[PDB]
Design a protein around this ligand. Structure first.
Ligand SMILES: CN1C(=N)N[C@](C)(c2cc(-c3cccc(C#N)c3)cs2)CC1=O
Length: 390
Protein backbone atom coordinates (compact mmCIF):
# COMPACT_ATOMS: atom_id res chain seq x y z
CA UNK A 1 0.00 0.00 0.00
CA UNK A 2 1.47 3.29 -1.16
CA UNK A 3 -1.39 5.54 -0.02
CA UNK A 4 -1.63 5.06 3.74
CA UNK A 5 -3.01 8.56 4.32
CA UNK A 6 -6.11 7.62 2.32
CA UNK A 7 -6.55 3.97 3.32
CA UNK A 8 -9.58 3.48 5.60
CA UNK A 9 -10.94 7.00 5.03
CA UNK A 10 -14.56 5.94 4.40
CA UNK A 11 -17.42 5.20 6.79
CA UNK A 12 -20.96 3.93 6.26
CA UNK A 13 -22.72 0.87 4.83
CA UNK A 14 -24.52 -0.15 1.61
CA UNK A 15 -27.97 0.81 2.85
CA UNK A 16 -26.91 4.32 3.91
CA UNK A 17 -24.10 4.86 1.41
CA UNK A 18 -20.39 5.44 2.11
CA UNK A 19 -18.94 8.86 2.92
CA UNK A 20 -15.59 10.63 3.18
CA UNK A 21 -14.74 13.68 5.26
CA UNK A 22 -14.19 16.93 3.37
CA UNK A 23 -13.78 20.59 4.26
CA UNK A 24 -15.23 23.61 2.47
CA UNK A 25 -14.53 27.31 2.94
CA UNK A 26 -12.05 29.45 4.86
CA UNK A 27 -11.64 28.74 7.69
CA UNK A 28 -12.43 25.09 6.82
CA UNK A 29 -15.90 23.73 7.62
CA UNK A 30 -15.89 19.95 8.05
CA UNK A 31 -18.67 17.88 6.42
CA UNK A 32 -19.26 14.19 5.71
CA UNK A 33 -19.79 13.63 2.02
CA UNK A 34 -21.35 10.67 0.24
CA UNK A 35 -19.03 9.17 -2.40
CA UNK A 36 -21.20 8.81 -5.52
CA UNK A 37 -19.90 7.54 -8.86
CA UNK A 38 -23.48 7.76 -10.16
CA UNK A 39 -23.76 11.56 -10.33
CA UNK A 40 -21.59 14.59 -11.05
CA UNK A 41 -22.47 17.44 -8.69
CA UNK A 42 -20.76 18.37 -5.43
CA UNK A 43 -23.75 19.46 -3.33
CA UNK A 44 -23.91 20.11 0.39
CA UNK A 45 -26.64 21.04 2.84
CA UNK A 46 -26.33 24.81 3.32
CA UNK A 47 -29.32 25.54 5.55
CA UNK A 48 -30.74 24.11 8.79
CA UNK A 49 -32.54 20.78 8.45
CA UNK A 50 -34.03 18.36 11.03
CA UNK A 51 -31.74 15.53 9.89
CA UNK A 52 -28.52 17.56 9.69
CA UNK A 53 -26.51 18.58 12.75
CA UNK A 54 -24.20 20.77 10.65
CA UNK A 55 -24.14 22.42 7.25
CA UNK A 56 -22.20 24.75 4.96
CA UNK A 57 -22.40 28.37 6.12
CA UNK A 58 -21.36 30.48 3.16
CA UNK A 59 -21.40 33.72 5.15
CA UNK A 60 -18.60 32.37 7.36
CA UNK A 61 -16.27 31.57 4.46
CA UNK A 62 -14.03 34.39 3.24
CA UNK A 63 -13.28 32.46 0.04
CA UNK A 64 -16.91 31.82 -0.90
CA UNK A 65 -17.90 33.07 -4.37
CA UNK A 66 -21.54 33.42 -5.43
CA UNK A 67 -22.27 32.23 -8.98
CA UNK A 68 -25.71 33.90 -8.82
CA UNK A 69 -27.52 30.91 -10.26
CA UNK A 70 -29.94 28.39 -8.84
CA UNK A 71 -30.11 24.68 -9.57
CA UNK A 72 -33.05 22.29 -9.27
CA UNK A 73 -32.30 18.59 -8.99
CA UNK A 74 -35.19 16.09 -8.88
CA UNK A 75 -34.52 12.37 -8.39
CA UNK A 76 -36.77 9.31 -8.69
CA UNK A 77 -37.50 9.78 -5.01
CA UNK A 78 -36.43 13.02 -3.41
CA UNK A 79 -35.14 16.30 -4.76
CA UNK A 80 -33.37 19.45 -3.69
CA UNK A 81 -32.97 23.05 -4.71
CA UNK A 82 -29.72 24.94 -4.29
CA UNK A 83 -27.59 27.95 -5.09
CA UNK A 84 -24.41 27.58 -7.11
CA UNK A 85 -21.06 28.98 -6.01
CA UNK A 86 -17.39 28.10 -5.57
CA UNK A 87 -15.08 27.76 -2.58
CA UNK A 88 -11.83 26.12 -1.50
CA UNK A 89 -12.28 22.39 -0.88
CA UNK A 90 -10.02 19.78 0.69
CA UNK A 91 -10.12 16.14 1.73
CA UNK A 92 -8.34 15.71 5.10
CA UNK A 93 -7.60 12.03 4.54
CA UNK A 94 -6.75 12.51 0.90
CA UNK A 95 -4.23 14.21 -1.37
CA UNK A 96 -2.59 17.12 0.41
CA UNK A 97 -4.00 19.74 -1.93
CA UNK A 98 -6.72 22.38 -1.79
CA UNK A 99 -8.77 23.29 -4.84
CA UNK A 100 -11.43 25.76 -5.90
CA UNK A 101 -14.51 23.77 -6.86
CA UNK A 102 -18.14 24.33 -7.71
CA UNK A 103 -20.51 23.76 -4.81
CA UNK A 104 -24.29 23.49 -4.97
CA UNK A 105 -25.46 24.91 -1.64
CA UNK A 106 -28.67 23.04 -0.84
CA UNK A 107 -31.25 25.43 0.60
CA UNK A 108 -34.41 23.39 0.10
CA UNK A 109 -34.93 19.63 -0.11
CA UNK A 110 -37.50 16.85 0.02
CA UNK A 111 -36.69 13.27 1.06
CA UNK A 112 -32.99 13.78 0.26
CA UNK A 113 -31.32 13.87 3.68
CA UNK A 114 -31.89 10.67 5.64
CA UNK A 115 -32.79 10.63 9.34
CA UNK A 116 -30.11 8.67 11.15
CA UNK A 117 -27.53 9.03 8.39
CA UNK A 118 -24.28 10.88 9.03
CA UNK A 119 -23.59 12.55 5.66
CA UNK A 120 -24.31 16.19 4.90
CA UNK A 121 -23.63 16.29 1.17
CA UNK A 122 -22.79 14.26 -1.93
CA UNK A 123 -19.68 14.12 -4.08
CA UNK A 124 -20.64 13.31 -7.66
CA UNK A 125 -17.60 11.61 -9.20
CA UNK A 126 -19.00 10.93 -12.67
CA UNK A 127 -18.55 13.16 -15.76
CA UNK A 128 -19.71 16.65 -16.74
CA UNK A 129 -22.20 15.33 -19.30
CA UNK A 130 -24.61 14.49 -16.49
CA UNK A 131 -23.93 17.43 -14.19
CA UNK A 132 -26.83 19.77 -13.37
CA UNK A 133 -27.88 22.24 -14.66
CA UNK A 134 -25.66 21.34 -17.62
CA UNK A 135 -22.17 20.19 -18.59
CA UNK A 136 -20.71 23.67 -18.05
CA UNK A 137 -20.60 23.12 -14.28
CA UNK A 138 -17.20 21.46 -13.88
CA UNK A 139 -17.38 18.42 -11.51
CA UNK A 140 -15.12 18.26 -8.47
CA UNK A 141 -12.72 15.63 -9.79
CA UNK A 142 -12.21 17.55 -13.03
CA UNK A 143 -11.28 20.65 -11.00
CA UNK A 144 -8.95 18.62 -8.79
CA UNK A 145 -7.06 17.18 -11.75
CA UNK A 146 -6.93 20.46 -13.64
CA UNK A 147 -5.66 22.44 -10.63
CA UNK A 148 -3.12 19.97 -9.19
CA UNK A 149 -0.71 17.19 -10.15
CA UNK A 150 -3.07 14.48 -8.89
CA UNK A 151 -3.31 11.65 -11.48
CA UNK A 152 -6.68 11.40 -13.26
CA UNK A 153 -7.78 8.24 -11.45
CA UNK A 154 -9.37 7.15 -8.18
CA UNK A 155 -10.15 3.77 -6.66
CA UNK A 156 -12.78 2.58 -4.22
CA UNK A 157 -12.85 -0.23 -1.69
CA UNK A 158 -16.32 -0.34 -0.06
CA UNK A 159 -16.39 -2.67 2.93
CA UNK A 160 -19.60 -4.36 3.99
CA UNK A 161 -19.30 -5.67 7.55
CA UNK A 162 -21.17 -8.91 6.88
CA UNK A 163 -23.42 -8.19 9.85
CA UNK A 164 -25.59 -5.29 11.10
CA UNK A 165 -23.85 -2.21 12.50
CA UNK A 166 -25.84 -0.27 15.09
CA UNK A 167 -25.91 3.52 15.34
CA UNK A 168 -22.73 3.64 17.46
CA UNK A 169 -20.87 0.92 15.59
CA UNK A 170 -21.42 2.35 12.12
CA UNK A 171 -19.89 5.59 13.40
CA UNK A 172 -16.79 3.92 14.82
CA UNK A 173 -16.27 1.35 12.06
CA UNK A 174 -14.01 1.66 9.01
CA UNK A 175 -16.24 1.49 5.94
CA UNK A 176 -13.58 1.37 3.26
CA UNK A 177 -11.14 3.44 1.24
CA UNK A 178 -11.22 6.05 -1.48
CA UNK A 179 -7.73 6.43 -2.93
CA UNK A 180 -7.52 9.69 -4.88
CA UNK A 181 -4.93 9.58 -7.65
CA UNK A 182 -3.77 6.01 -7.29
CA UNK A 183 -4.10 2.28 -6.66
CA UNK A 184 -3.23 0.88 -3.23
CA UNK A 185 -2.13 -2.76 -3.49
CA UNK A 186 -3.03 -3.58 0.13
CA UNK A 187 -6.74 -3.31 -0.72
CA UNK A 188 -7.00 -6.30 -3.04
CA UNK A 189 -5.65 -9.76 -3.77
CA UNK A 190 -4.96 -11.34 -7.12
CA UNK A 191 -4.93 -9.42 -10.38
CA UNK A 192 -6.79 -6.35 -11.58
CA UNK A 193 -8.85 -6.86 -14.75
CA UNK A 194 -10.01 -3.87 -16.78
CA UNK A 195 -13.16 -3.26 -18.77
CA UNK A 196 -13.53 -0.24 -21.06
CA UNK A 197 -15.53 2.81 -20.03
CA UNK A 198 -17.95 2.74 -22.98
CA UNK A 199 -18.77 6.43 -22.83
CA UNK A 200 -17.87 9.15 -20.36
CA UNK A 201 -21.08 10.34 -18.71
CA UNK A 202 -21.98 7.74 -16.09
CA UNK A 203 -19.24 5.16 -15.62
CA UNK A 204 -20.82 3.00 -18.33
CA UNK A 205 -19.63 -0.54 -19.02
CA UNK A 206 -20.76 -3.53 -21.08
CA UNK A 207 -21.80 -6.90 -19.62
CA UNK A 208 -21.45 -9.74 -22.13
CA UNK A 209 -22.63 -12.84 -20.24
CA UNK A 210 -24.29 -13.66 -16.94
CA UNK A 211 -24.14 -16.94 -14.99
CA UNK A 212 -25.91 -18.18 -11.87
CA UNK A 213 -23.77 -20.93 -10.31
CA UNK A 214 -22.06 -21.42 -13.68
CA UNK A 215 -25.34 -21.73 -15.58
CA UNK A 216 -25.66 -19.28 -18.47
CA UNK A 217 -28.70 -17.03 -18.08
CA UNK A 218 -28.63 -17.33 -21.89
CA UNK A 219 -30.24 -14.00 -22.74
CA UNK A 220 -29.43 -11.78 -25.74
CA UNK A 221 -26.50 -9.89 -24.20
CA UNK A 222 -28.07 -6.61 -25.30
CA UNK A 223 -30.70 -7.24 -22.62
CA UNK A 224 -28.03 -7.03 -19.92
CA UNK A 225 -27.20 -3.45 -20.96
CA UNK A 226 -30.67 -2.13 -21.73
CA UNK A 227 -30.54 0.75 -21.76
CA UNK A 228 -27.07 1.00 -20.18
CA UNK A 229 -24.96 -0.65 -17.47
CA UNK A 230 -23.15 1.52 -14.92
CA UNK A 231 -20.95 1.23 -11.80
CA UNK A 232 -22.57 3.29 -9.03
CA UNK A 233 -21.34 3.58 -5.44
CA UNK A 234 -24.48 5.66 -4.84
CA UNK A 235 -26.85 2.72 -5.31
CA UNK A 236 -27.24 0.03 -2.64
CA UNK A 237 -28.41 -2.87 -4.79
CA UNK A 238 -27.30 -4.71 -7.86
CA UNK A 239 -30.11 -3.48 -10.12
CA UNK A 240 -31.01 -5.33 -13.32
CA UNK A 241 -33.26 -4.52 -16.31
CA UNK A 242 -36.78 -5.90 -15.78
CA UNK A 243 -36.41 -8.93 -18.06
CA UNK A 244 -32.95 -9.79 -16.78
CA UNK A 245 -34.14 -9.42 -13.19
CA UNK A 246 -37.04 -11.79 -13.83
CA UNK A 247 -34.74 -14.41 -15.41
CA UNK A 248 -32.09 -14.01 -12.69
CA UNK A 249 -34.61 -14.35 -9.86
CA UNK A 250 -36.11 -17.44 -11.46
CA UNK A 251 -32.63 -19.00 -11.64
CA UNK A 252 -31.63 -17.93 -8.11
CA UNK A 253 -34.94 -19.36 -6.84
CA UNK A 254 -34.24 -22.65 -8.62
CA UNK A 255 -30.69 -22.85 -7.25
CA UNK A 256 -31.91 -22.22 -3.68
CA UNK A 257 -35.06 -24.36 -3.99
CA UNK A 258 -34.33 -26.48 -0.91
CA UNK A 259 -35.76 -23.55 1.04
CA UNK A 260 -38.85 -21.56 0.08
CA UNK A 261 -38.88 -17.80 0.59
CA UNK A 262 -41.93 -15.49 0.46
CA UNK A 263 -42.53 -13.27 -2.56
CA UNK A 264 -41.84 -10.28 -0.34
CA UNK A 265 -38.26 -11.48 0.15
CA UNK A 266 -37.54 -11.67 -3.57
CA UNK A 267 -39.10 -8.22 -3.96
CA UNK A 268 -36.52 -6.86 -1.54
CA UNK A 269 -39.33 -5.80 0.78
CA UNK A 270 -39.15 -8.24 3.67
CA UNK A 271 -36.23 -9.73 5.52
CA UNK A 272 -35.52 -13.39 6.17
CA UNK A 273 -33.86 -14.59 9.34
CA UNK A 274 -32.00 -17.65 10.57
CA UNK A 275 -30.84 -18.72 14.01
CA UNK A 276 -27.53 -17.03 14.83
CA UNK A 277 -24.70 -18.43 12.73
CA UNK A 278 -26.83 -20.80 10.66
CA UNK A 279 -27.41 -18.72 7.51
CA UNK A 280 -27.38 -21.36 4.71
CA UNK A 281 -24.97 -19.53 2.42
CA UNK A 282 -24.28 -22.74 0.49
CA UNK A 283 -27.82 -23.12 -0.85
CA UNK A 284 -27.60 -19.72 -2.58
CA UNK A 285 -25.71 -19.48 -5.91
CA UNK A 286 -22.74 -17.34 -6.83
CA UNK A 287 -23.41 -14.79 -9.59
CA UNK A 288 -20.92 -14.06 -12.36
CA UNK A 289 -20.97 -11.01 -14.60
CA UNK A 290 -18.68 -11.18 -17.65
CA UNK A 291 -17.39 -7.80 -18.77
CA UNK A 292 -15.85 -6.75 -22.08
CA UNK A 293 -12.06 -6.89 -21.81
CA UNK A 294 -9.46 -4.46 -23.16
CA UNK A 295 -8.28 -6.90 -25.83
CA UNK A 296 -10.39 -7.71 -28.90
CA UNK A 297 -12.75 -10.68 -28.37
CA UNK A 298 -11.57 -11.06 -24.79
CA UNK A 299 -13.66 -10.82 -21.60
CA UNK A 300 -13.23 -11.52 -17.90
CA UNK A 301 -15.68 -12.26 -15.11
CA UNK A 302 -16.36 -10.99 -11.60
CA UNK A 303 -18.15 -13.38 -9.28
CA UNK A 304 -20.03 -12.44 -6.13
CA UNK A 305 -21.44 -14.53 -3.32
CA UNK A 306 -24.73 -14.39 -1.46
CA UNK A 307 -22.66 -12.72 1.27
CA UNK A 308 -22.64 -9.77 -1.13
CA UNK A 309 -26.22 -9.89 -2.44
CA UNK A 310 -27.96 -10.67 0.87
CA UNK A 311 -27.71 -7.38 2.82
CA UNK A 312 -27.45 -7.77 6.62
CA UNK A 313 -30.23 -5.98 8.48
CA UNK A 314 -31.17 -5.77 12.15
CA UNK A 315 -34.21 -7.85 13.06
CA UNK A 316 -37.40 -6.01 14.01
CA UNK A 317 -37.14 -7.69 17.41
CA UNK A 318 -33.39 -7.01 17.60
CA UNK A 319 -33.16 -10.75 18.33
CA UNK A 320 -29.99 -12.81 18.09
CA UNK A 321 -30.98 -14.07 14.65
CA UNK A 322 -28.94 -13.18 11.56
CA UNK A 323 -31.26 -11.46 9.10
CA UNK A 324 -30.96 -10.12 5.55
CA UNK A 325 -32.81 -8.48 2.70
CA UNK A 326 -32.42 -9.60 -0.91
CA UNK A 327 -30.33 -6.84 -2.51
CA UNK A 328 -30.95 -7.50 -6.19
CA UNK A 329 -33.84 -5.52 -7.68
CA UNK A 330 -35.34 -4.50 -11.00
CA UNK A 331 -34.56 -1.34 -12.90
CA UNK A 332 -36.22 0.48 -15.78
CA UNK A 333 -33.01 2.43 -16.41
CA UNK A 334 -30.46 -0.29 -17.09
CA UNK A 335 -28.09 -2.34 -14.97
CA UNK A 336 -26.66 -0.67 -11.88
CA UNK A 337 -23.68 -2.28 -10.22
CA UNK A 338 -24.22 -0.79 -6.78
CA UNK A 339 -22.70 -1.40 -3.35
CA UNK A 340 -23.72 -5.09 -3.65
CA UNK A 341 -21.19 -5.56 -6.43
CA UNK A 342 -18.66 -3.03 -5.19
CA UNK A 343 -18.35 -4.55 -1.72
CA UNK A 344 -16.88 -7.66 -3.30
CA UNK A 345 -14.20 -5.81 -5.23
CA UNK A 346 -11.58 -3.10 -5.20
CA UNK A 347 -12.71 -0.91 -8.11
CA UNK A 348 -10.33 1.32 -10.05
CA UNK A 349 -11.87 4.23 -11.94
CA UNK A 350 -9.03 4.83 -14.41
CA UNK A 351 -10.32 7.98 -16.08
CA UNK A 352 -6.94 8.63 -17.70
CA UNK A 353 -7.12 5.34 -19.61
CA UNK A 354 -10.92 5.29 -19.96
CA UNK A 355 -11.24 1.98 -18.12
CA UNK A 356 -12.53 0.45 -14.90
CA UNK A 357 -10.51 -2.20 -13.09
CA UNK A 358 -11.79 -4.93 -10.78
CA UNK A 359 -9.91 -7.08 -8.29
CA UNK A 360 -11.05 -9.26 -5.39
CA UNK A 361 -11.44 -7.00 -2.35
CA UNK A 362 -9.27 -7.61 0.70
CA UNK A 363 -12.39 -6.83 2.75
CA UNK A 364 -15.10 -8.84 1.00
CA UNK A 365 -17.23 -11.09 3.19
CA UNK A 366 -17.10 -14.82 2.44
CA UNK A 367 -17.02 -18.26 4.08
CA UNK A 368 -14.46 -21.09 4.24
CA UNK A 369 -15.84 -22.70 1.09
CA UNK A 370 -16.23 -19.88 -1.45
CA UNK A 371 -14.68 -16.52 -2.23
CA UNK A 372 -15.52 -13.69 -4.60
CA UNK A 373 -13.38 -13.80 -7.77
CA UNK A 374 -12.11 -11.86 -10.80
CA UNK A 375 -10.91 -14.25 -13.49
CA UNK A 376 -9.94 -14.29 -17.14
CA UNK A 377 -9.50 -14.22 -19.97
CA UNK A 378 -12.36 -15.79 -21.92
CA UNK A 379 -12.92 -15.77 -25.66
CA UNK A 380 -16.07 -13.74 -26.37
CA UNK A 381 -17.25 -12.65 -29.82
CA UNK A 382 -19.27 -9.65 -31.05
CA UNK A 383 -19.21 -7.95 -27.65
CA UNK A 384 -19.88 -4.58 -29.31
CA UNK A 385 -23.34 -5.95 -30.13
CA UNK A 386 -24.04 -6.19 -26.41
CA UNK A 387 -24.12 -2.42 -26.11
CA UNK A 388 -27.47 -0.66 -26.44
CA UNK A 389 -28.24 2.22 -28.81
CA UNK A 390 -31.40 4.36 -28.69
C1 LIG B 1 -28.88 6.28 -7.67
N1 LIG B 1 -28.50 7.72 -7.55
C2 LIG B 1 -27.18 8.10 -7.35
N2 LIG B 1 -26.16 7.27 -7.61
N3 LIG B 1 -26.91 9.37 -6.88
C3 LIG B 1 -27.97 10.34 -6.52
C4 LIG B 1 -27.39 11.75 -6.70
C5 LIG B 1 -28.39 10.14 -5.06
C6 LIG B 1 -28.01 9.11 -4.20
C7 LIG B 1 -28.59 9.24 -2.92
C8 LIG B 1 -28.35 8.29 -1.81
C9 LIG B 1 -28.80 8.54 -0.48
C10 LIG B 1 -28.56 7.60 0.56
C11 LIG B 1 -27.87 6.39 0.29
C12 LIG B 1 -27.43 6.13 -1.02
C13 LIG B 1 -26.72 4.91 -1.33
N4 LIG B 1 -26.15 3.94 -1.61
C14 LIG B 1 -27.66 7.06 -2.06
C15 LIG B 1 -29.42 10.37 -2.83
S1 LIG B 1 -29.45 11.22 -4.28
C16 LIG B 1 -29.20 10.13 -7.44
C17 LIG B 1 -29.56 8.63 -7.64
O1 LIG B 1 -30.72 8.30 -7.86
Amino acid sequence: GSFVEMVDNLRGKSGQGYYVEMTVGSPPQTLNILVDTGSSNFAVGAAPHPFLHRYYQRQLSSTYRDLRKGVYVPYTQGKWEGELGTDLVSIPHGPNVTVRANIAAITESDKFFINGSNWEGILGLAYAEIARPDDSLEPFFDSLVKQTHVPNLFSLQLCGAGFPLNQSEVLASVGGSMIIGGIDHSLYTGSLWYTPIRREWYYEVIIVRVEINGQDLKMDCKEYNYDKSIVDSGTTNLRLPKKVFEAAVKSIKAASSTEKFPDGFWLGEQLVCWQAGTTPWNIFPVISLYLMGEVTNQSFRITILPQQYLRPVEDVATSQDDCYKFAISQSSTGTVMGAVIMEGFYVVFDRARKRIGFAVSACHVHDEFRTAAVEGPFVTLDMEDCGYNI
